Design a protein around this ligand. Sequence first.
Ligand code: MG
Ligand code: MG
Ligand code: MG
Ligand code: MG
Ligand code: MG
Ligand code: MG
Ligand code: MG
Ligand code: MG
Ligand code: MG
Ligand code: MG
Ligand code: MG
Ligand code: MG
Ligand code: MG
Ligand code: MG
Ligand code: MG
Ligand code: MG
Ligand code: MG
Ligand code: MG
Ligand code: MG
Ligand code: MG
Ligand code: MG
Ligand code: MG
Ligand code: MG
Ligand code: MG
Ligand code: MG
Ligand code: MG
Ligand code: MG
Ligand code: MG
Ligand code: MG
Ligand code: MG
Ligand code: MG
Ligand code: MG
Ligand code: ZN
Lengths: 155, 144, 87, 151, 25, 81, 129
Amino acid sequence: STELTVQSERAFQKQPHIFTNPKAKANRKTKRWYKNVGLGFKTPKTAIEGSYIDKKCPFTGLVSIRGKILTGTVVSTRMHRTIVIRRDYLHYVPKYNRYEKRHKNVPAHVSPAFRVQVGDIVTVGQCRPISKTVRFNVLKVASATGKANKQFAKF
Amino acid sequence: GKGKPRGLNSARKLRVHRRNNRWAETTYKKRLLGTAFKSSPFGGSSHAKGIVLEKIGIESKQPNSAIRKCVRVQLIKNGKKVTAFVPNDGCLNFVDENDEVLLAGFGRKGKAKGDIPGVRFKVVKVSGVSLLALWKEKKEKPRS
Amino acid sequence: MENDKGQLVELYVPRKCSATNRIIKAKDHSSVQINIAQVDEEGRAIPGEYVTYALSGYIRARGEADDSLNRLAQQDGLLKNVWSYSR
Amino acid sequence: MGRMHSKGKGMSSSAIPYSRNAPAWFKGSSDGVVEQIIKYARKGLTPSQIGVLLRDAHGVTQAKVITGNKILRILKSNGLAPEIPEDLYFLIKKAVSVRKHLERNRKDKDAKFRLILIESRIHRLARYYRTVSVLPPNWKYESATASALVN
Amino acid sequence: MRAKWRKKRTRRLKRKRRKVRARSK
Amino acid sequence: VLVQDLLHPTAASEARKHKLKTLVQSPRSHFLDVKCPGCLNITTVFSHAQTAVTCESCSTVLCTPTGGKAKLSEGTSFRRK
Amino acid sequence: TRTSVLADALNAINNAEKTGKRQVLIRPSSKVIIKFLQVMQKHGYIGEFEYIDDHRSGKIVVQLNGRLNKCGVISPRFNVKIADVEKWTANLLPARQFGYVILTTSAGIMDHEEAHRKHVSGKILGFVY
RNA sequence: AGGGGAUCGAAGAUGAUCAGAUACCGUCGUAGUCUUAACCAUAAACUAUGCCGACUAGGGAUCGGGUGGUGUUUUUCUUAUGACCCACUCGGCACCUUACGAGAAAUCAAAGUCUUUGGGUUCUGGGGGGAGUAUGGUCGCAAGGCUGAAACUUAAAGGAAUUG
RNA sequence: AGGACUUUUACUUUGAAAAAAUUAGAGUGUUCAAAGCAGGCGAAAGCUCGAAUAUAUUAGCAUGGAAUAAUGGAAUAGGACG
RNA sequence: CGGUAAUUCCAGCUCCAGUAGCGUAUAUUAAAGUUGUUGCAGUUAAAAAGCUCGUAGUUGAACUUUGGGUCUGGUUGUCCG
RNA sequence: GGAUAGUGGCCUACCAUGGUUUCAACGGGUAACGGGGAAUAAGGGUUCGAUUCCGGAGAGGGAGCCUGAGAAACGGCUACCA
Ligand SMILES: [Mg+2]
Ligand SMILES: [Mg+2]
Ligand SMILES: [Mg+2]
Ligand SMILES: [Mg+2]
Ligand SMILES: [Mg+2]
Ligand SMILES: [Mg+2]
Ligand SMILES: [Mg+2]
Ligand SMILES: [Mg+2]
Ligand SMILES: [Mg+2]
Ligand SMILES: [Mg+2]
Ligand SMILES: [Mg+2]
Ligand SMILES: [Mg+2]
Ligand SMILES: [Mg+2]
Ligand SMILES: [Mg+2]
Ligand SMILES: [Mg+2]
Ligand SMILES: [Mg+2]
Ligand SMILES: [Mg+2]
Ligand SMILES: [Mg+2]
Ligand SMILES: [Mg+2]
Ligand SMILES: [Mg+2]
Ligand SMILES: [Mg+2]
Ligand SMILES: [Mg+2]
Ligand SMILES: [Mg+2]
Ligand SMILES: [Mg+2]
Ligand SMILES: [Mg+2]
Ligand SMILES: [Mg+2]
Ligand SMILES: [Mg+2]
Ligand SMILES: [Mg+2]
Ligand SMILES: [Mg+2]
Ligand SMILES: [Mg+2]
Ligand SMILES: [Mg+2]
Ligand SMILES: [Mg+2]
Ligand SMILES: [Zn+2]
């Protein structure tokens, strides 16, 4: 779901205020800026040497992670640059001393550094309001597959 | 064991089952539908004034032979017309035609009481004064 | 049963079925108390000395009174191998 | 005594003997038994018939007692396990047979109901084998495609 | 009365009302 | 009945009850060593066999499938295992 | 389908006690049944039971002495806060001087008095008295 | 709709019974009954007892299967079957006795293991009538099916059993 | 106090938090009480104890436990260590 | 209850209940185990879909360290200082 | 990119076709302001909470705005409707 071109749209895609000097003769790829969101969260190497831009990247973009940390399961990865996470829980009705299965749908914004798909459990973190509905940035794909790590069977 | 589920995660169906069964009662159905406001002569009202249209007496049932002295009153709050009961012995003459009368409930939850058919309201006050004060000659009708 | 001073306050400790350890009601008008006479060396029933078994009304009504008495008498050395603990 | 799809309450079964180890009187070799199992499978036999043959013609009480592995497990170690598990395959065989009988005579409604029952059982077993990833997650039973798997 | 015949009379009333509505539908 | 051993019931009662219903459930079946008059090979067969078992040397059946246990052939001699 | 095995065990105990017997044969014999009967032994409501290995979930033979009068499971193992223990004891036990709400804590399966002594509470298993 | 078309028989035709009798008794008698396609989805569709699971009490029988008999007739010389006889077991429609359990009882071996109240789970009821009516959906060619109140009225309606 | 890996829960104990008024409840002769948060004691020459506590049963945070209930490992070894 | 002896209507007498309060009307709570999670009923009283399959929901067999010995800390009832 | 004090489909331009839902979304009703709380009381609960405290909203219904740090103010203005 990611275009091969590093910028595909009409506007140029740059990380704002990080400048690579062409008059200099180092001729490295670029000057890519990055940061670690803390909380003992490892910045992915795909972000460390990646070439995407993703203004709202917790690792490369301007957005900062602070506040709630929610673990959920991916229910929809098929809307661009964003994720829809199903969070399940049990509401305790006290008149019966019984619990009640319930679910909420938390939108979030998964960076291109992560490769997500329907069913991956995901650790996500709070941030600024990014869109009308997304307020969380995907911080870790704990279960990349879960039960698809071993696929074939050749004895 | 029993009809209801018992699992620790069955709060939802227990609650909705109780919520669907609650409509079997009459008090709950009346309270939630709010039929009192829409259909009853008074909308959740203990008392209501009205104007006497005419002056009727209604026969009793089989086991009781008499004619209970009623009065047809058109309610002023909304315009409905209901029969009402003039309670005591010599109080029929006390209430004259086309005077304001304050009807009250008949004490049987809006249902006909005793042997009087098709009546559901007493008479407590007439022309601003109470019937009980007139019946013991403590006060007199203003006659306005 | 026991007052804090240590004095008994119960009206009476009830008997218990010698076969099922269940207590015997005051008005349990089916229960029985069997007496089996002690026997000396020459087969003379020694008088006033015996062994008592209180069978409840419940087992009697059920139909297991004789079997329970068989086992209970075999345990206390009255009958020889009349009852086998393994059916 | 459940009989998932009928009113039956039977309990006709087999009682596995208490001793897990090999019977004292058995003289055959575990390697020979595994070779026999492999040869029977190469003949084109499902594990159940293999167990039946080893129990009748030979002293094999059961493979797990003698070898330590199960018959399907032994076949899978050698890569002879069928792509479709045997019980599900037999269910599809029965379903296609009943569908053939139906399309050759329409008015039989009892066999129509029995086909419904068999298809329900097929769906249940397919769901199980799909949640254990024995079958691919895209695997499904369809009336038109069942014949190809059976044939 | 039997519930059967009360039901049948209700059905006949529905007959009349249905034909009336059909004539005026 | 009121007092009774279940850990050690009489072996007669053990053979009395159904399989799957003993203290420990054990099969009532057994294996047999059969000799066919043809050759001297000893074949191990099952009491409740389900197939027309034959000796590998000669195409002669030694058992016959039956609703219950195997019905042996006429002249084959067996010993219980 | 056998859902709550402890329910079957305690029901068998109750049936074999009301009829006055001195033994029960419980078939499935899980951990929880063993711990339940061990608590009952510790408090005396039961006699001398026995585990019979089957290689097949095992079984249990229970010896009684008529001292018990009723077992019983609270089939939905309700989360019981330490405040609600007294509520369950009042609702289940016949008197405050005896009876025991057998409940499962993080420190094992214990009678309610022992759990109150450890000042720990968990889910409720059943009741004996 | 197409095929058949014997019997029996809604409607109808009459002959009787009666005060009336287009009801019961009788004689004819279309539609229907019988079918191939397409609809219908309701019955006192009843065991008026939801399904799965465990335990609790004695007695015989009966159906299907399986085990054993030093069993009996069978006859094919003996045997193998089969058919019985005895014992046991699994499963099924059932049945008798009893309360030591349950019920308001009639009664139930489940309608037991329920104030000593919790094995899992689905559907339904909250006095009677109005009423399974109206309306609104939805299915049906139609018949009608599914869903389905209120206004109002009423002190009872109802269950089992006892004596007359 | 730093890199390092953290199976994930449900559950439960303890604590921080859940504004005051209200409820509970301690002290206190408003003449008793409803109340109120007052008051008490000196020789009469200023000396004083107060304005206590608990609960809220959900959501969040920390914490000890690991029975009960659920999920995950190593089956093509692409497994664990040196 | 009242149809010629009204312990029930209208009064007089006596008495009863609460008492500066008491009576009525509607609403609501306990009674209501007549909303039943604790805690209801379904053979006949109202109530088991005609039967079966089946997604969601609810629920779901047993099994993975139990023992022991010592030392040692608080809290008890101990015998007495 | 514009606007915002500032994030934000908050608005615009160009793209993608997406988001919620039998765990009841959406719609309808509320003689519904939410809560702290009140009545009731074996335990579980049922009903009420317009009102002495905390929040929110409103000044006849609607929109629009100047001044200021703070108003879409109404015992401030502008207009329409009544
Ligand atoms: Mg025709
Ligand atoms: Mg005629
Ligand atoms: Mg005639
Ligand atoms: Mg005729
Ligand atoms: Mg004829
Ligand atoms: Mg019907
Ligand atoms: Mg029915
Ligand atoms: Mg009704
Ligand atoms: Mg009706
Ligand atoms: Mg309609
Ligand atoms: Mg009757
Ligand atoms: Mg507070
Ligand atoms: Mg107070
Ligand atoms: Mg008189
Ligand atoms: Mg009821
Ligand atoms: Mg009836
Ligand atoms: Mg009925
Ligand atoms: Mg039914
Ligand atoms: Mg499902
Ligand atoms: Mg389990
Ligand atoms: Mg409110
Ligand atoms: Mg309002
Ligand atoms: Mg308020
Ligand atoms: Mg208002
Ligand atoms: Mg305010
Ligand atoms: Mg304002
Ligand atoms: Mg005004
Ligand atoms: Mg200023
Ligand atoms: Mg304004
Ligand atoms: Mg003003
Ligand atoms: Mg102002
Ligand atoms: Mg101004
Ligand atoms: Zn040979």
